[PDB]
Design an enzyme around this catalytic site. Structure first.
Site, PDB file in Angstrom:
ATOM      1  N   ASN A 169      -7.709   9.297  -5.406  1.00 57.61           N
ATOM      2  CA  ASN A 169      -8.317   8.271  -6.556  1.00 57.61           C
ATOM      3  C   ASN A 169      -9.249   9.211  -7.710  1.00 57.61           C
ATOM      4  O   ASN A 169      -9.362  10.381  -7.513  1.00 57.61           O
ATOM      5  CB  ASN A 169      -9.471   7.589  -5.666  1.00 57.61           C
ATOM      6  CG  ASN A 169      -8.740   6.997  -4.147  1.00 57.61           C
ATOM      7  OD1 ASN A 169      -7.851   6.203  -4.681  1.00 57.61           O
ATOM      8  ND2 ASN A 169      -9.096   7.082  -3.082  1.00 57.61           N
ATOM      9  N   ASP A 222     -12.490   9.205  -8.039  1.00 55.28           N
ATOM     10  CA  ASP A 222     -13.797  10.055  -7.502  1.00 55.28           C
ATOM     11  C   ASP A 222     -13.092  11.239  -6.714  1.00 55.28           C
ATOM     12  O   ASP A 222     -14.377  12.165  -6.186  1.00 55.28           O
ATOM     13  CB  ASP A 222     -14.548   9.240  -6.565  1.00 55.28           C
ATOM     14  CG  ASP A 222     -13.851   8.590  -5.439  1.00 55.28           C
ATOM     15  OD1 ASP A 222     -12.662   8.900  -5.121  1.00 55.28           O
ATOM     16  OD2 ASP A 222     -14.250   7.517  -4.898  1.00 55.28           O
ATOM     17  N   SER A 238     -11.521  11.325  -3.982  1.00 57.80           N
ATOM     18  CA  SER A 238     -11.129  10.818  -2.446  1.00 57.80           C
ATOM     19  C   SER A 238      -9.591  10.674  -2.441  1.00 57.80           C
ATOM     20  O   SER A 238      -8.806  10.726  -3.633  1.00 57.80           O
ATOM     21  CB  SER A 238     -11.875   9.673  -1.991  1.00 57.80           C
ATOM     22  OG  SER A 238     -11.564   8.711  -2.997  1.00 57.80           O
ATOM     23  N   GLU A 285       0.757  -1.371  -0.138  1.00 55.64           N
ATOM     24  CA  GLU A 285      -0.034  -0.051  -0.069  1.00 55.64           C
ATOM     25  C   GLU A 285       0.927   1.409   0.122  1.00 55.64           C
ATOM     26  O   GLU A 285       0.588   2.150  -0.842  1.00 55.64           O
ATOM     27  CB  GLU A 285      -0.831   0.020   1.099  1.00 55.64           C
ATOM     28  CG  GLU A 285      -2.093  -0.967   0.983  1.00 55.64           C
ATOM     29  CD  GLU A 285      -3.322  -0.587  -0.099  1.00 55.64           C
ATOM     30  OE1 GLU A 285      -2.967   0.469  -0.592  1.00 55.64           O
ATOM     31  OE2 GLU A 285      -3.896  -1.572  -0.277  1.00 55.64           O
ATOM     32  N   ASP A 337      -6.245   8.634  -0.516  1.00 50.78           N
ATOM     33  CA  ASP A 337      -5.597   7.506   0.449  1.00 50.78           C
ATOM     34  C   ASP A 337      -4.673   7.949   1.173  1.00 50.78           C
ATOM     35  O   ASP A 337      -3.693   8.482   0.672  1.00 50.78           O
ATOM     36  CB  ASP A 337      -5.456   6.284  -0.335  1.00 50.78           C
ATOM     37  CG  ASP A 337      -6.590   5.578  -0.894  1.00 50.78           C
ATOM     38  OD1 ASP A 337      -7.580   5.947  -0.647  1.00 50.78           O
ATOM     39  OD2 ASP A 337      -6.246   4.652  -1.783  1.00 50.78           O
ATOM     40  N   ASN A 394      -8.977   5.503   3.233  1.00 52.12           N
ATOM     41  CA  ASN A 394      -9.808   6.412   1.973  1.00 52.12           C
ATOM     42  C   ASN A 394     -10.449   7.275   2.743  1.00 52.12           C
ATOM     43  O   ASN A 394     -11.359   7.133   3.531  1.00 52.12           O
ATOM     44  CB  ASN A 394     -10.615   5.426   1.098  1.00 52.12           C
ATOM     45  CG  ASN A 394     -11.188   6.079  -0.125  1.00 52.12           C
ATOM     46  OD1 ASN A 394     -11.022   7.335  -0.152  1.00 52.12           O
ATOM     47  ND2 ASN A 394     -11.660   5.434  -0.889  1.00 52.12           N
ATOM     48  N   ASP A 452     -15.795  -4.661   9.274  1.00 56.02           N
ATOM     49  CA  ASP A 452     -16.884  -4.078   9.013  1.00 56.02           C
ATOM     50  C   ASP A 452     -17.618  -4.938   7.989  1.00 56.02           C
ATOM     51  O   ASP A 452     -18.629  -4.747   7.454  1.00 56.02           O
ATOM     52  CB  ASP A 452     -16.713  -2.808   8.150  1.00 56.02           C
ATOM     53  CG  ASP A 452     -16.170  -3.025   6.561  1.00 56.02           C
ATOM     54  OD1 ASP A 452     -15.649  -4.019   6.248  1.00 56.02           O
ATOM     55  OD2 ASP A 452     -16.008  -2.011   6.005  1.00 56.02           O
TER      56      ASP A 452
END
Ligand SMILES: [Cl-]
EC number: 3.2.1.17
Length: 129
Positions: A46, A48, A50, A35, A52, A59, A101
């Protein structure tokens, strides 16, 4: 801060990630390597809009607030900049929420593509833990 492999393994173990939700330490070290290359200051944008952040590339679409991702959530209740600290506490605490989650470590694309189903124990080999 750019962690060494064994240095990061020991930090993660101290913070309670070893076998957290059934994921052995090697999984977490492998994810961090691909990562962020073990760099707490890593950021990536990203498509969209957003971003990281940090050693586990958390994110801003869901998990932290960076003030520039409209209509996003802040499920870890932290500013995204907190994830860039040399102290990995905030990143780990937020990662624990993510992995719990429902989707496990599949939330991390590099883990799914590069660690899942491999010999992840090799990532902690030789380390004093
Ligand atoms: Cl799972």
């Amino acid at each position: 801060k750019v962690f060494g492999r064994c240095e990061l393994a020991a930090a993660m173990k101290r913070h309670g990630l070893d076998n957290y939700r059934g994921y052995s330490l090697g999984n977490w070290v492998c994810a961090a390597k691909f990562e962020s290359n073990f760099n707490t200051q890593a950021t990536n944008r990203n498509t969209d809009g957003s971003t990281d952040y940090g050693i586990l590339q958390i994110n801003s679409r869901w998990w932290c607030n960076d003030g520039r991702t409209p209509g996003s959530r802040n499920l870890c209740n932290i500013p995204c900049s907190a994830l860039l600290s040399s102290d990995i506490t905030a990143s780990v605490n937020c990662a624990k929420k993510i992995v719990s989650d429902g989707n496990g470590m599949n939330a991390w694309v590099a883990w799914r593509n590069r660690c899942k189903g491999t010999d992840v124990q090799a990532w902690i080999r030789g380390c004093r833990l």
